[PDB]
Amino acid sequence: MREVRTIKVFTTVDNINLHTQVVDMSMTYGQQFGPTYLDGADVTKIKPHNSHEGKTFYVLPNDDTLRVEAFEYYHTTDPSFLGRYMSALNHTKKWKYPQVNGLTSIKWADNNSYLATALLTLQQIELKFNPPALQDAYYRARAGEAANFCALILAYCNKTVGELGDVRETMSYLFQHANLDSCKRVLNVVCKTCGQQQTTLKGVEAVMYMGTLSYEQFKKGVQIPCTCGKQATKYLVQQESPFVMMSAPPAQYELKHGTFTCASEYTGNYQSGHYKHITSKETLYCIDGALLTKSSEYKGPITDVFYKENSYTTTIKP
Ligand SMILES: Cc1cccc(NC(=S)NCCN(C)C)c1
Ligand SMILES: Cc1cccc(NC(=S)NCCN(C)C)c1
Ligand SMILES: [Cl-]
Ligand SMILES: [Zn+2]
């Protein structure tokens, strides 16, 4: 064969901006591009095919044009992000995403129940992501194709497919990448020996609390240790957010219809467990991936409860 036989392909980091390439079919993609992927699959050690003509390949950002695009799209500089995203995508593109009670869920696979619950929660709270990658993928998940959204969640949370996940920790990562700058929380803490003390929390900190599942109990007061050695009380002074997340180590808890938005239930230990999702609508639905049951009341090992909010100020006279 005289001269090199070639094909035209496009490389990308964000799957929107394309970069024309002529590739030599006698060499692998890795020899010509560095690590290369085709819709999640690692083709780095593969030589081009005629069927590859015109297709888009993900590559790592090795030149300043790809770097600017990658960061603008993903808001990250982690050198392994894009590989980790493609590894996850190769699995999540195979998962199933059924509509359960009007929401996009995920049929159980690969220990993914924490992702199912996280995805179902997102569709019930008001949240705008900042990274365009997350906006595009979330919009597409809402409509049914969550494969890219779930791979991105995995990649942002630095969990690989199959690894144990926490819903609260995942929610925390996603909240970091969301506009919550309009959120504010004022707390006060009362100690018999030490006195009063107010604290103001902003952004993410201000919509997550660890220690009680009850927003009522949070408004009324909760007991905590003080530097002196005694128990002090912490109560909510003011709240400004479209939702609040209350979390605590899993514990038997009664979910009362119409008193909360949705919740996470965790059964197991630190080694091994399973998440179910409970949403309060016309009744209480339990969504367990593809599975759906209902009940008028619920008692279970609850670990996260989501409530909604706009503005709240305490009637407690300090
Ligand atoms: C995608 C992107 C955009 C802008 C800057 C950087 N960061 C770089 S290229 N910094 C040093 C190399 N380390 C990553 C190992 C990465
Ligand atoms: C250290 C700590 C403190 C408070 C809450 C949790 N979260 C838990 S125990 N969640 C259960 C699901 N994970 C085990 C995968 C962990
Ligand atoms: Cl968004
Ligand atoms: Zn004290």
Author numbering: -1 to 316
Study text:
SARS-CoV-2 papain-like protease (PLPro) plays a key role in both viral replication and host immune suppression and is highly conserved across the coronavirus family, making it an ideal drug target. The main protease and papain-like protease (PLPro) are responsible for the cleavage of nonstructural proteins 4–16 and 1–3, respectively. PLPro cleaves the C terminus of ISG-15 (RLRGG) with sub-μM affinity allowing for the virus to delay the immune response, resulting in increased levels of infectivity for SARS-CoV-2 compared to other members of the coronavirus family. Although we were not able to obtain crystal structures with the NMR protein construct, the full-length protein (residues 1–314) containing two cysteine to serine mutations (C111S and C270S) did produce suitable crystals for X-ray diffraction with structures for 3 different protein-fragment complexes being solved.
The X-ray structures confirmed our NMR studies, showing class A fragments bound at the S4 subsite adjacent to the BL2 loop region, while class B compounds bound at a previously undocumented binding site in the finger region. Fragment 5 binds in a different orientation to most other PLPro inhibitors, foregoing interaction with Y268 and instead sitting in a small hydrophobic pocket traditionally occupied by the V70 side chain of the ubiquitin-like domain. Additionally, the amine group of 5 forms a hydrogen bond to the side chain of D164, a key binding interaction maintained by GRL-0617 and its analogues. To determine the binding site of the two fragment classes, GRL-0617, a PLpro competitive inhibitor, was tested against PLPro and was found to give a chemical shift pattern indicative of the class A fragments, suggesting that they are binding to the active site. All class A fragments displayed some degree of inhibition of PLPro at 1 mM with the most active fragment 8 showing 62% inhibition.
